[PDB]
Amino acid sequence: AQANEDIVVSKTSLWKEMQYNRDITIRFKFASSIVK
Amino acid sequence: INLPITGSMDTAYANSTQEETFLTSTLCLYYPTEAATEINDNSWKDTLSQLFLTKGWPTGSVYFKEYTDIASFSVDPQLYCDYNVVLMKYDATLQLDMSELADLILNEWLCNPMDITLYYYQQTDEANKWISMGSSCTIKVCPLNTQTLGIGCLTTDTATFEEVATAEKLVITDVVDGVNHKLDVTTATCTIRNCKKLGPRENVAVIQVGGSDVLDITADPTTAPQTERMMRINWKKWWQVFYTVVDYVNQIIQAMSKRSRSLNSAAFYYRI
Amino acid sequence: INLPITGSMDTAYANSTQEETFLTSTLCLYYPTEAATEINDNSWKDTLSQLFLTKGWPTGSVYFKEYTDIASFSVDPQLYCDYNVVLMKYDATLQLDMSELADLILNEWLCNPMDITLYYYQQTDEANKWISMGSSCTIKVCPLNTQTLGIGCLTTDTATFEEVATAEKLVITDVVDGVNHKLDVTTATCTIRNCKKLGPRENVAVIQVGGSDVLDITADPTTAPQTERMMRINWKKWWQVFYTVVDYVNQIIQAMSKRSRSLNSAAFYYRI
Amino acid sequence: QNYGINLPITGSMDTAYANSTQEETFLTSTLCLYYPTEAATEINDNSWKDTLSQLFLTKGWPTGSVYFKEYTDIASFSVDPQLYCDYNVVLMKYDATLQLDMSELADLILNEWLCNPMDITLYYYQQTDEANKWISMGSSCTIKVCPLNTQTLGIGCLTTDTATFEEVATAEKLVITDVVDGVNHKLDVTTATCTIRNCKKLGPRENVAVIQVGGSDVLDITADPTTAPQTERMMRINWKKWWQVFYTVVDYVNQIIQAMSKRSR
Amino acid sequence: QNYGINLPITGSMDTAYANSTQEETFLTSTLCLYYPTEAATEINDNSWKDTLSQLFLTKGWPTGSVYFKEYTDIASFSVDPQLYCDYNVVLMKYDATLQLDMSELADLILNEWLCNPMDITLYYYQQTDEANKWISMGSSCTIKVCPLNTQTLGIGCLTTDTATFEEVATAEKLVITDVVDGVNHKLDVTTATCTIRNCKKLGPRENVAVIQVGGSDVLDITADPTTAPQTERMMRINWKKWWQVFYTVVDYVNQIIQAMSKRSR
Amino acid sequence: DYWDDSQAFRNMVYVRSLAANLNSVICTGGDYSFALPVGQWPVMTGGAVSLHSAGVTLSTQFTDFVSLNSLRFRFRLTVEEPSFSITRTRVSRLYGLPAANPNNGKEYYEVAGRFSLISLVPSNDDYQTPITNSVTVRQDL
Ligand SMILES: *[C@@H]1O[C@H](CO)[C@@H](O)[C@H](O)[C@H]1NC(C)=O
Ligand SMILES: *[C@@H]1O[C@H](CO)[C@@H](O)[C@H](O)[C@H]1NC(C)=O
Ligand SMILES: *[C@@H]1O[C@H](CO)[C@@H](O)[C@H](O)[C@H]1NC(C)=O
Ligand SMILES: *[C@@H]1O[C@H](CO)[C@@H](O)[C@H](O)[C@H]1NC(C)=O
């Protein structure tokens, strides 16, 4: 299985239950408030 | 060929194809550096050729190919001849390595490549394995669940992976067939290939020069067989080894049989 | 049951009882602390359970039982499961110890106690042996002649006796059958029992993880057998060993067969 | 000689009644009493075992066939009872504070269990039939259990917070736990001191015989509160001494061993 | 399923032609184009491979069936050309200073060689028929040959003095040497940098296809200077760009794969 | 909270079977110089703390430009050896992280992960859920 798969576990006419299995690179950052 | 063959039990036994298969075939020995070191002679190859000449093999039919070590030979072996003999030194610190070498050369493998980054693979049957070659192979695996996450491991934190190899030149790996594994490999230094074990290679013959029979070709623990072309010797020199091989070369090549699959100089077929 | 059984050869081969024996049976591994150490993970048991689950063995049927040393395990081994696997390391200095362990768990024994001080015992057949368990057993024996005197020993001088064990946690002693022996044992730390070897235990499977075949189950120096639930692996890691045992557990259980005699947790029956 | 197989055995009704096996089963079998320390204490003698064996001799049990094995208390004997003989008798004192202990002991020894192991940390167990129970032994067992629902969540308990669990045992040396059959239970146990085993009750063990030395019949062997049986090898006695008890056991050992039958297994 | 044998196969002329195996071989096969660095350089794009795969998709070849493998120079490709695919195309640029090199390349890949090793230092070799040649691969081959007479002495050369030897290769990466068949030769080769193998030619390799992007038909596969053939899978093109060459390969891949047949070996 | 331009987050409003494998990292505080008018300049320097993976949920990232139905990764903290201390002051050797310069002059804190879910997406792969915003909240403020 690919590292970035996308699969369908159920599908009706308009809707569909899609499975997703994916790798991510969370690059976040704090931020500080300074009140003097 | 899909067609059948027919025969009979009344026909006569033909003459010996020996003394002609010799002429129209080539022989190749694989000796360790230790042999030439203990010998300290520069014409031993021509000597052994002149000896083989009595057994029938003509002058330009025998060949010798040095290999510094079992693992340096295990790194992408290339057996390109018609009758190969290998002389293998025994060491309990190298048992699995010189069993994997056996499993690789005695058998005939059909190998596809592997892209670990873009794909996650699995073994279908008890003949599919992963064989990895290079200078230092460190292989770790995380088995996966139905939703493509980890089982006793973290799909990202490579420290949580499960180590099946540590700085090994040739690794033959079998994992639980039916689940998807995420791999981590030293791809810079090692290539890994998904290989299926076909019928055996009857062109080569391993000769364990020292200790008792330990080679377990079959990765399953139940069989532990001993094929006909897996021989053993007890040794204290190397000239006696080579004289014994030359004296009993007919039995060896009667235990061996030319190939049927194809013409190929590597130790494994490639089918992408 | 004493009655006879009858059958035929026209009757049909019923379906595979595998995939139902897995559901209605239990599997139990006996691994060394070395393996837990080299693994250094606190979820590998759940990992292997989830793996086995694909082979059919349900969750609550697979069990793991750590044993620190071959000798510590040899001290009254307690197997109470329907399918027992044992992973046994190889050490030349422990060859006879890990052979006696095999001889004890693979086979089924019927044991009576022994009262050394009050009585003097002998062996009758080639299966009546004296098995001694404990933390440090040092055994000595004096054979006796027809008229209850010593032969190469004195009935009083414990130093004239013939030593057969030196601080061994498990010993299996075979002496000459037909003569009475006076014993001296460290009874404070060890218990010795006169046991008869019955038919084999088909519930257990030994797996020598390391070197060449050394186990001589039978005491007589003529058979040197190799049974079916006695395997051999060549190893450099332990995750490969466990993945192998898992991928090939069906061959193991096909090599094993549930017991016939009775329900028992010990490795030997007691009948006083 | 076919083992592991069960075949139909035939018979008749005109065959004659073969001779008595008593006075030979004694010679070719062994007997083993399990007496409490209280009895030897009251006796205060160092030859009473030899005396009882010399008496047994008259009933046919030879010297090296009878054995005595002492135990300090009912629970200390409940911890892993090893009844390994051809005939076992167990003298048992009555105390209202130990009724359940000496019912569990009876349930354990009188019956022949098939015990498989258990691994609490990983697996969550359930009882399938009315004969599957969890027997825990050791020096101090403290067991708590949480039933679970269809989606692996708790019922009046939290899978994480062990305190929320329901306590069925509190520092018991032997516990036989029967819970509702059909619901996966998560357990917490003092595994450092106790071992717990999933045991299915097979047919009874006809090789043992419990003798309650004091009070009325109390032993509710069957977990189901409907049978409340009283087998043939569940005896009762009134006592003001112990020498009288032992003389009685001796003088009526034949009926005892007629009520006891050697094992099948 | 009999391997290692060759038996007769029978048929007839009444049975009817099957459906087109095209549109299924494309789905269960692999295709591999070998382009030169000049092409990527002139194109100057990093998605041209995905583009060509998307185009092949219109022809039926799926996404991961088509592979592109660069080769900086004809000689760098001649050095151990490893074609491991079920269909191989090789775009080859013409250069009148490289005719023989890129004809040896053709004679190597188009044909199927049974290659055995060679130990120059010990043995003196001869050729047996018009298909046994000596093919040498490496970084810098410098081969010299001394023919010998019946009495193991040289002809116009001295068995010791290497400068007397006759030169047939100097600073070549791939050589294919054909010499007189029936006389023992002695060799001097740069074994450190080139490995030489005694190789017998067999039936062709119908799995690879050469495409001369530029100049006229010059490839003389056949050593014997009487045939000068032009096989079905030795094609030619005229070029002023490379996008047109790739679009042409795409638009006429079916013809190419009808000209190529999967290997027997 | 995390969000991408991938197909997983295009119309995600419903999610089940949620789970993720995240690796642990170490967040180290920096050096904040309290710029006093006159005198000395105390500097709050130090502080290290290891973030370990924890449960996962959903959330909504609200901003003045985009609104995102996003994936919420939690992290728990285990105090590390480097402590934070205000220099030229009677405070030191107290674990935690300071809220003045947590980044330590870094552009970001990187951590790789994998996520696995099951969402409800209209069968037609052309539907779009509103992302952008135009906010006028807190007019009283
Ligand atoms: C086979 O051997 C026999 C005995 O030497 C000989 O007479 C016969 O000619 C041989 N066969 C052929 C085809 O030469
Ligand atoms: C026996 O095996 C056959 C073949 O798989 C199957 O069709 C049949 O249903 C099986 N019968 C039983 C009773 O398991
Ligand atoms: C059985 O008992 C009768 C009466 O005591 C006796 O005569 C007979 O011999 C006994 N059977 C055997 C086999 O001794
Ligand atoms: C063979 O080709 C014909 C013509 O297109 C088609 O009708 C037929 O279905 C094909 N055969 C099979 C087995 O599909």
Ligand SMILES: [Ca+2]
């Ligand atoms: Ca190896």
Ligand SMILES: [Ca+2]
């Ligand atoms: Ca792990």
Ligand SMILES: [Ca+2]
């Ligand atoms: Ca496998």
Ligand SMILES: [Ca+2]
């Ligand atoms: Ca021993």
Ligand SMILES: [Ca+2]
């Ligand atoms: Ca002596």
Ligand SMILES: [Ca+2]
């Ligand atoms: Ca004996």
Ligand SMILES: [Ca+2]
């Ligand atoms: Ca109790």
Ligand SMILES: [Ca+2]
């Ligand atoms: Ca509660």
Ligand SMILES: [Ca+2]
């Ligand atoms: Ca119950």
Ligand SMILES: [Ca+2]
């Ligand atoms: Ca050339």
Ligand SMILES: [Ca+2]
């Ligand atoms: Ca010359």
Ligand SMILES: [Ca+2]
């Ligand atoms: Ca020629």
